[PDB]
Amino acid sequence: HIDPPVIDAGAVPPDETGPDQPTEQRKICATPTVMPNSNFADRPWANDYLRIQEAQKFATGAGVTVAVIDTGVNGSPRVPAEPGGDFVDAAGNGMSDCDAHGTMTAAIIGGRPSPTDGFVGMAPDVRLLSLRQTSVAFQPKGARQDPNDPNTTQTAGSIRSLARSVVHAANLGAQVINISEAACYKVTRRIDETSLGAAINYAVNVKGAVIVVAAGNTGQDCSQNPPPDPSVPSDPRGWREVQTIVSPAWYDPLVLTVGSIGQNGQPSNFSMSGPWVGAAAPGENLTSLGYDGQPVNATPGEDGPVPLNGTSFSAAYVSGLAALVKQRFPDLTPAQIINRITATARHPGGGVDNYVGAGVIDPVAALTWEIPDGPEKAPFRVK
Template sequence: MSTQQGGQGLATPAPQLALDLPRAWDFSRGAGQLVAVIDTGVSRHPRLPDLDAGGDYVAEGGDGTSDCDGHGTVVAGIIGAKPVADQGFSGVAPDARLLTIRQTSKVFQREGRSGEQRPEDQPDGYGDINALASAVRRAADWGATVINISLVLCTDGSYNPADGPLGAALRYATLERNAVIVVAAGNKEQNCNAGNPGINPLDPSGDLWKNLSTNVTPARYDDYVLTVGSIDRNGQPSAFSVPGPWVGVAAPGEDIVSLDARGTGTITGFVNQQGGVTPLKGTSFAAPYVAGVVALVRARFPELTPLEVIKRIQATAHAPAEGWNPYIGYGAVDPVAALTNEVPPTLPPKQPTSPRSIQLAVAAPAPPPDNRARNIALVGSATVAILLTLGMLASFPIRRRFGVTGDDM
C-alpha cells in the first residue's frame, strides 16, 4: 500500500484545533509515560525518536518496527509525534515514549495459504485474537501505562466470540499492571457493517446490551477498556462509527494527518489498489487521540488508577444532552478539561433512563399595579376641567345683560 503525501506546512490539522493542544500542553506533555501501540507495527521515523521495539506476532524475527500497512505508524504519530518548526501537525503527547508491537497486517496471511489462491488474489491478511491477548500482556509486563488498540473483531450480535483469553489479558493489564487501555469502537465495514441500533424512541430505557446486531471485541470488555467513537469536524458522530453500549467517549476520526511509514514527512491518505486516494479516517484514528490524552492525564495525575483515569476523561468530555448515548458515549474528549476540572463523584449510567414527567414550579402572579396616584391626578384634572367649563357657561347671560350694543350709541 502506497501513501499519499500531505499535511505539510504551518496549517494545524482540524482535529488538533478541536482539542486545543497548545493550551493542554501548559499542564502536561505526557512525560514519563509509555504508550504501547498494538497494531500493524510502527516504522522508525525522525519524529518518533522515543520508540521502543516490543516484538512481532506477524513475521518471525521481527521486532515491531516494520509497518508494511502504514496504519500503525499513523496511529503512533497521532499519539506522540514530536513537533517541529514550520509544521502544524504534532502528536497529542509529544513527551511520551512509544512501544510498538506488531499483531496484524493486511499484506500477510497464514503459511501455505498463497498456494490455494490465484496469482491475482490479494492476501487474506493476518491477525489472531489469541496473539492480541499475548500482545496485551506483553505491553503490560513491559510497563506500558497506556495501551492503544485500534484493531477490532466484529461478530454477529447473538454470537459469543471465543475471546476469553483477550478478556483475561485486558483485566490483567488494567487491574494488576496499572495500564489504561484505549480501544476503537469499529467502523461500519466488512464484519462490522451491521453496526448496532441506537436508542429506541418507543423504548428509550431498553437494555442496549440485549439488542446487539454486532459484537465488537475488545470494545465489549467495557469494565476494563475505554472505547472511542468517531466524530467529524462539526462534532457530529461519523457515519462509519459503530455505536454500542460500550462507547465511552468520542474524538476526531476524520480529516486526519499523521506520519508517513515510508518517508520522513506526513500523509493525509493511502493510495488504494485502484490508484485512488483513501483519506485517513476511522475510529482507529480517533482512539489514539484519546490515548494521547490519557498519557497527558497520567503524567499530571500519577496517583490515579486506570479506572479513575477513564472516569476523569469521561466526566470532563463535552456531553450530549442526554448525558450519554451509544454514538459518542459521554461526549467529545476535552484535554484541557481532563487536566484541570473537578470530577463529580458519579457519572450518568451508560444506559438511557425512562422519561419522567416533572411539574415545574409555577411563579406566583405579580401583584396588581398601584394606580392610586394616577387615579387621583386624573380625578383632580377632570374636576378642574368641569369647573372651568361651568364657569364659562355661567358667564354668557351676564355678558348679554351688561354688554354694550349698537343701538345705544
C-alpha cells in the same frame, strides 16, 4: 441476543510473541502519501478542535510509556518508537509497518513537533512501544482448519494474538495501551475470547494500565448496530438490539472504547455504535506523520489518495490524552484516569449514547477541572 461479557480471570494467556499460527507476506508494503495542495504549516484541524497546544501547557506525557498495538511503525526521529514485539511476522519486532497505519497512529499519540510544520502529537514526550498485531499484508500459510468452527476464523486468531499482545505490552511496562483492532462477529458465530478478557483484566487491574480501544469501523464483518429501543427503559443502551459484537470494544468499562467524529463535530457514519462506546474523538480527514516523520494526510486508493479516517485514530487521540492525564496525576488508577476523561467529555443533549458514549473528549478540561477521584477499580462480571 447478547449480554455483556464475563471475564475468566484465571485464563491469562502466556506472554509470548508471534502469530496465532505461521504466516507469510502476500501483499507489497503500503506507503502513506499527501493530498494535492496540502499546506502542512497550519495546524491540523484536530489539533485546533482539541486545543492540543493549550492542553500541552499542563502536561506533555513525559515519563509515560504508550504501547501502540496496531500494524507496526516505521520509526523516525519524530516518531521514535521502540520494538514491542511482532504478533504477525514471527521474524519481526514491531518496528515494521507494512500497512501505512500504525506509524500514523503512533504519531498522533506522541509524534514530536517540528519548526517546519504545524503537526504535533497529543503527548510528544511519551515513550512509544510498537506491537504489530494486525496486517492486511499477511496470511496464514496453512488453510482452514474446519470452515464452520468460528474459533478457526482469522477474526478468532486475531483475538487470541491480541490477548498475548496485551499481556506483553503490560509486562513491558506500558501505562497506556492503545488498541486499533476491533474484531467483529455475530451473536450466532460466537468466538471463545476468554483469553482476551483475562488479558485485559490482568493489564488493567494487576498492572495498572489504561486501555483505550477503537470502537471499530463499518465494513466487511462489522455491520452497524441498530439503536436502543427507547420503549425498554431497563435496557437503555440496547444490549438486546445488538447484532454485532465488537471486541475488545465491549469490555467497557475496563477499557475506554472510542468512536469517531468528523471535522464539523458530527458522529462519523463509519463509526461502529454499541452499548459499550464510552467517548469519541476526531477520526476523519486527519494529518499525521509518515515513515520519515514528515506530515502525511493520505493513503493511496484505487481512484486516488484517500484521507486518514478511522476510530483507531480517534482512540489514538484519547490514548494521548490519557498519557497527559497520567503524567499530571501520577497516583490515579486506570479507572480514575478514564473517569477524568469521560467526566469532561461532552455532546449536545448529554448523557451517554451508543455513538459517542459520554461524548467528545475535552483535553484541557480533563487536565484542569476539579473532578472527584472515582473508585480505584471499575466493576465487572467475573466467573
